[PDB]
């Protein structure tokens, strides 16, 4: 469960894992679809809450 809890803060980079979790597969879909440099999806569970303050800095 510590390795399961490791996943959500380390969604696409886990670096010592002998298992295929769900978020490994969803990395590949983004890796195959037109997903640029580290977006919302790469900022999962850490950056997607930082959006409302981000757009406030651009648009007031």
């Amino acid at each position: 469960k510590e390795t399961v809890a490791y996943v959500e803060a380390k969604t696409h980079n886990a670096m010592n894992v002998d298992a295929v979790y769900q978020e490994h597969v969803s990395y590949i879909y983004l890796r195959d679809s037109g997903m640029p440099l580290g977006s919302l999806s790469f900022e999962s569970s850490k950056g997607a809450l930082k959006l409302y303050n981000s757009l406030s800095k651009s648009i007031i």
Partner: protein, 60 residues
Amino acid sequence: KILVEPPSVDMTVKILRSLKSKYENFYGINITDKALVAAAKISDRFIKDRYLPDKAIDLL
């Protein structure tokens, strides 16, 4: 289908900056570092049919 992305101009600055050793040893003439950034950013807003690494490298 492995989608090849455009190389995002500020990285082409880092590409040409790594290529300072080769062109200056190709034909000798010293290249300023203002114009290397200016070789890429002026290529954006003006040339359309070519794209980022071709524009950044052919002009030099």
